[PDB]
């Protein structure tokens, strides 16, 4: 190619030039200051997202979302905002609450998280990311803006036809993320999403394909009540396991469970809480320290594991819930400023709508991995010599990328039962 590897490559490199500027704490040892506090930044706009939109779902729904696959997504639209369409940015993502030296090169940062991400040791631990922008042809963007994208995020905009071929676009955009997803995430925009109106687009997945460091035995798998929230309970299928797992009972007996996937670099985070006590009050509780303390305090344990079979997911519109938090001008057509895609083409300039979707599917193998069949059976007794963490009520969820310390995915299982 032209350019040199980002991932190598330093900031004393790489002339990176935003049209648009808006200027110990015990780091881990062997850490990039920077990249860290780039995380730091990611894990507050999750739990502060998950939290919001949690209060307008039902405590009996299940939830999930990928707020690294949102934050990583708009990041990019902000390669080229300005004003109030970036201080909003900056406010509702936390990418304000680090240093100006962190605050100001996000894209380079980024640019590194995404290289110690997407990279590979594809075992049976693989990662693909999927976003993208979408505007119209009858505009020309920036090519500043252009190679910059490919180089932070590679993917550069994408013009397609959308005041005159909107279904036609519509089929673009989606069957652009079904291929990436290895034909598994489809139908990211639905129709009537999209009309002969749609200036600026933003989609946004990340997938998740991998299997359990340590597996568990469909043989061990069985029916078994999970009580939901509203007191009634219904059959799912429990996976069994024995082994030592990291674990830490904390606050208020609520549990805290970590399954590796082969590799220990992603794991699944279970937070537990005992049988009384509600999984919205520990939402309520959840903060980025909150969860980090809980994380260190692991530590390796013989334990009984019974945990069930599930696919949580969701298609999201993000446009509600970010503006309701704060994101406004970027989705007003009056009040957006992205000068850094385009200079005033056919005039203002902003994200008609922005599209979101994750989803998890676990079971003995992994994350989207050999589904069984075999007939569960039913009943289990109880296991001798020791109790048992049994996540057969409300549970939350996160799947971490552990070196780089990121919230790849985070969701609730309120409800995994039959189908
Ligand atoms: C396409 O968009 C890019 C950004 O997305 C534009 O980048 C330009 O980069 C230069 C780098 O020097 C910026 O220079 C300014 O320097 C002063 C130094 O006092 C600093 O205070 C500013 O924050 C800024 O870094 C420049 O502002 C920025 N765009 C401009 C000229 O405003 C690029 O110029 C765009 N190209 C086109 C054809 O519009
Ligand atoms: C970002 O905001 C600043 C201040 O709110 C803008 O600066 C003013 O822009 C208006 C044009 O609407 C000029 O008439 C003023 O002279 C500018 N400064 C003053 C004296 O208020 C700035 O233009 C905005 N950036 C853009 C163009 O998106
Ligand atoms: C996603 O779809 C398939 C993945 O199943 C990709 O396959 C390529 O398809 C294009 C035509 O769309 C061919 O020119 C390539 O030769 C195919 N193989 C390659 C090089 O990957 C396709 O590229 C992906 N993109 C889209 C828009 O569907």
């Not at 119209?136 to 190679?147: M, R, V």
């Not at 990291?246 to 970590?258: D, N």
Request: hydrophobic share 40%.
């Amino acid at each position: 190619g032209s350019p040199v590897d980002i991932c190598t490559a330093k900031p004393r490199d790489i002339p990176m030039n935003p049209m648009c500027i808006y200027r110990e704490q015990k780091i881990p040892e062997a850490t990039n200051r920077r990249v860290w506090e780039l995380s730091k930044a990611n894990s507050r706009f999750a739990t502060t997202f998950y939290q919001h939109l949690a209060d307008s779902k039902n405590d009996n729904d299940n939830i999930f979302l990928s707020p690294l696959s949102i934050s990583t997504a708009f990041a990019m639209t902000k390669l080229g905002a300005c004003n109030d369409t970036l201080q909003q940015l900056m406010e509702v993502f936390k990418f304000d609450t680090i240093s100006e030296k962190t605050s100001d090169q996000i894209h380079f940062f980024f640019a590194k998280l995404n290289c110690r991400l997407y990279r590979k040791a594809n075992k049976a631990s693989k990662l693909v990311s999927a976003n993208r922008l979408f505007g119209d042809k009858s505009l020309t963007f920036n090519e500043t803006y252009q190679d910059i994208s490919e180089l932070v995020y590679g993917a550069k905009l994408q013009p397609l036809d959308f005041k005159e071929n909107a279904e036609q676009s519509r089929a673009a955009i989606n069957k652009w993320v079904s291929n990436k997803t290895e034909g598994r995430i489809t139908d990211v925009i639905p129709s009537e999403a999209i009309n002969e109106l749609t200036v600026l687009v933003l989609v946004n997945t990340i997938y998740f394909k991998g299997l359990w460091k340590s597996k568990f035995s469909p043989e061990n798998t069985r029916k078994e009540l999970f009580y939901k929230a509203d007191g009634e309970s219904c059959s799912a299928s429990m996976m069994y396991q024995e082994g030592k797992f990291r674990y830490r009972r904390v606050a208020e007996g609520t549990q805290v469970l970590e399954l590796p996937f082969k590799g220990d670099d992603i794991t699944m985070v279970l937070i537990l809480p005992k049988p009384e006590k509600s999984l919205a009050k520990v939402e309520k509780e959840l903060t980025p320290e909150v969860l980090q303390e809980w994380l260190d305090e692991l530590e390796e344990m013989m334990l009984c594991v019974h945990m069930p079979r599930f696919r949580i997911e969701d298609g999201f519109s993000l446009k509600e819930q970010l503006q309701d938090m704060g994101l406004v001008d970027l989705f007003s057509p009056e009040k957006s400023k992205l000068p850094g895609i385009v200079a005033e083409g056919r005039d203002d300039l902003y994200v008609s709508d922005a599209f979101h979707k994750a989803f998890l599917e676990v079971n003995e193998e992994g994350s989207e991995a050999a589904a069984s069949t075999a007939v569960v059976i039913a009943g289990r007794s109880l296991n001798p010599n020791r109790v048992c963490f049994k996540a057969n009520r409300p549970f939350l969820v996160f799947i971490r990328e552990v070196p780089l310390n990121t919230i790849i995915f985070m969701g609730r299982v309120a409800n995994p039962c039959v189908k």
